[PDB]
Write a protein that binds this ligand. Structure first.
Ligand SMILES: O=C1CCCC(=O)C1=C(O)c1ccc(C(F)(F)F)cc1[N+](=O)[O-]
Ligand SMILES: O=C1CCCC(=O)C1=C(O)c1ccc(C(F)(F)F)cc1[N+](=O)[O-]
Ligand SMILES: [Fe+2]
Ligand SMILES: [Fe+2]
Lengths: 362, 362
């Protein structure tokens, strides 16, 4: 009500080779190029590709020859953190209202409300800062009907789209922060955006023995925009969050979860298109039926495809994670098919731990 | 004879994201991953992918976290020049003999002869500097039979290979140097490697009227290794060599040409796989029959796929150029099919110029 959001406008990646990245997400991930902005249309400093899959939208920008503060920012970001997210854009009914609200409540401004206008309409943009070097651009595109944003031109798919759509929406966007900074960012979203803490959290219990991490997730009123916040935790095993902060060079987006209507078909398509996922211990499946019960996907194909599952009091979910999409063990993706569960797979930390422990006896 | 060369051992690219670059070359270019070296096998600083297609071999290397002189060099090179070639490796029968010969005749040593050994044998490596930041690793792998080089492990293809092999060898590698430095570098190969000039060249006539570039070509005795050297020239066309030098930030490899036994099938596979080639004016095919004569491929299909052709006293060749593989207007590739001609398609500068002029009048 006081800080209304319509959903994620786009996940903007600052990358070293936008042309090849756009090819990767088109083929490996099955997305489709719909808009572009570069030298061929008068935008000489950066090349920007807009890929889409249902309502999921990724923007891949790369600086050609730095000349403005933004250009120099991207160049430095890519060199320092490697390919990663710089903007978790949020669509709002009113950018000026949202910006003022966020600033009145403590947020730091990255961009004052401004307007872009072309033959397709007007778009009001505003931006505030969140963890590390990441920002949230507040986008009011109610008066625009073009390809993406004024300055962008329609573009054709780099390749034929896959027979079955790989994904159709963004479920959640996860951020990794330093130890001791989780609750601070959680409070930030509660205050600055009027978000609400969801029931599911990864507490000290699971944190120190199975996950090596603590998490809490904030979401808007409609439960569309969901932002889980991870932080390292001491366990017997090295923390994947610490490894992230170490190789990324600070706080940043760890992974983006994408909704699919058929995770089985999504994985078959993605695997054949060249994407590798995590290797789930086969013994995980031996005891899956005992704690998760029956699923719409028989255990044999979950086992064949390395797909995971989790069950809570509201239902269940099917999930799978890709390996990092760069060489730095930093950002990766998650494909998720929900069936009642509103969780994030917290039960798999223990399940996989105990599953590994018994592969080690065989 | 005093500097025998077996051919191109590999063309090593320094990239910002080796994962996605390997996927790009596997899918768009149709190559297969055969070897790998990264954190997973004990090589913590860099991730390196070896791609192959016939005798053509590309090595895509990316630094994860720089810790050595080589790692820091890779990181710097990528930030300063964008994705590009850092090594035109040449296979030799004796890496020590070749390194001593090069250094005696003027070359700057970049790496003294050293040996790498593992379960698959021994390789002797040496290295000298060429234009810009490029080097030539002199490789003696006569006593090695593994995946690529000691330290690399066998790898499976990222995806299933295309029905028809896209290309099978490296025809030539072109370097772009500054104004007035062409003859210096052609001289360098004549003196340091014993290469002699081919007759094929682009000068006075072509340069200041059609090409906006001057070019000479050195080659070894067996003519397997070919190195055309380009420099900028003044015409009423902004020079593409100037564009390269400006956005790349100095001299460096402009393009690698690749042999295909069937350019029609190659272009069909590559086009469906996502690669875009230069847009050849339709009017080029109207008068093509007049100056180039009959070809094994009918003009109707050459026109459809935008494949070019050229003829000389020895025969003809069929060729096509890809758009650059990064956002910077720098490196690109060429697919070539020879039929007697020892040329490089210089006849197409006049042909394309007049074809463009014709499409304009209408
Ligand atoms: O999405 C989230 C937010 C809460 C913390 C978290 O770990 C999230 C995961 O996507 C998740 C959940 C479970 C697992 C498991 F157990 F399978 F390894 C892994 C991840 N994960 O890698 O993000
Ligand atoms: O390979 C060479 C070396 C000599 C100079 C040269 O232009 C080379 C080409 O591959 C070439 C030839 C013709 C054309 C044309 F006319 F089609 F535009 C383009 C290129 N080229 O972009 O390298
Ligand atoms: Fe998740
Ligand atoms: Fe060429």
């Amino acid at each position: 009500d006081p800080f209304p959001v319509k959903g994620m406008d786009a996940v903007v990646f600052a990358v070293g080779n936008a042309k090849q990245a756009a090819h990767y997400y088109s083929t490996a991930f099955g997305m489709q190029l719909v808009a572009y902005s570069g030298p061929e249309n008068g935008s000489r400093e950066t090349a920007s590709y807009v890929l889409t899959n249902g309502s999921a939208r990724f923007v891949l920008t790369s600086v050609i020859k730095p000349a403005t503060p933004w250009g120099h920012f991207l160049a430095d970001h890519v060199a320092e953190h490697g390919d990663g997210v710089v903007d978790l854009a949020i669509e709002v009914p009113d950018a000026r209202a949202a910006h003022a609200y966020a600033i009145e409540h403590g947020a730091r401004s990255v961009a004052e409300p401004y307007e872009l206008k072309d033959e397709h309409g007007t778009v009001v943009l505003a931006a505030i800062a969140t963890y590390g070097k990441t920002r949230h651009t507040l986008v009011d595109r109610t008066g625009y009907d073009g390809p993406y944003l004024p300055g962008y031109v329609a573009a054709a798919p780099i390749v034929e789209p896959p027979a079955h759509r790989t994904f159709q929406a963004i479920d959640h966007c996860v951020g990794n922060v330093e130890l001791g900074r989780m609750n601070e960012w959680v409070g930030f979203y509660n205050k600055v955006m009027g978000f609400t803490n969801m029931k599911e959290f990864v507490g000290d219990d699971i944190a120190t023995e199975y996950s090596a991490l603590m998490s809490k997730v904030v979401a808007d009123g409609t439960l569309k925009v969901k932002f889980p916040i991870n932080e390292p935790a001491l366990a017997k095993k090295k923390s994947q969050i610490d490894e992230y902060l170490e190789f990324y060079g600070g706080a940043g987006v760890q992974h983006i979860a994408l909704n699919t209507g058929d995770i089985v078909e999504t994985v078959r398509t993605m695997r054949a298109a060249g994407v590798q996922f995590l290797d789930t211990p086969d013994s995980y499946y031996d005891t899956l039926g005992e704690w998760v019960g029956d699923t719409r996907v028989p255990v044999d194909t979950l086992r064949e495809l390395k797909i995971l599952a989790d069950r809570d009091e509201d239902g269940y979910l099917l999930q799978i994670f890709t390996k990092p999409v760069q060489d730095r063990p930093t950002v990766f993706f998650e494909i998720i098919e929900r069936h009642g569960s509103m969780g994030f797979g917290k039960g798999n930390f223990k399940a996989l731990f105990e599953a590994i422990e018994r592969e080690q006896e065989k």
